[PDB]
Ligand binder design. Structure first.
Ligand SMILES: *[C@@H]1O[C@H](CO)[C@@H](O)[C@H](O)[C@H]1NC(C)=O
Lengths: 49, 49
């Protein structure tokens, strides 16, 4: 799924704690509201623990 | 309008537009002008009824 032409909101993404993994490779997640990107892609699959 | 599609990059809906699907043979009553433009990949629309 491609996400584009929209204003990102990662606030609810890190203000939740139900997730178990919040590792961000390449870019530091501490600065995400200051960064403007061109394209957002989001994959989704289920895998065993 | 087409056969099939594989992947896409952009979409848009905006506000609904209501129009008449009945065709006649009478004289015209409205005039519509459109301008399509591209600099640096910017797709531009200029229109006024
Ligand atoms: C869509 O798929 C084609 C493969 O035919 C690929 O070349 C193209 O880069 C893809 N588009 C996007 C936006 O990933």
């Amino acid at each position: 799924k491609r996400i584009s032409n929209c204003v990102a909101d990662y606030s609810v993404l890190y203000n939740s704690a139900s997730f178990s993994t919040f590792k961000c490779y390449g870019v530091s997640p501490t600065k995400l509201n200051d960064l403007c990107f061109t394209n957002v892609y989001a994959d989704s699959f289920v895998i065993r623990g | 309008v087409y056969s099939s599609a594989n992947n896409c990059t952009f979409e848009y809906v905006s506000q609904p537009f209501l129009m008449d699907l009945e065709g006649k043979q009478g004289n015209f009553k409205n005039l519509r002008e459109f301008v399509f433009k591209n600099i640096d990949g910017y797709f531009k629309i200029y229109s006024k009824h």
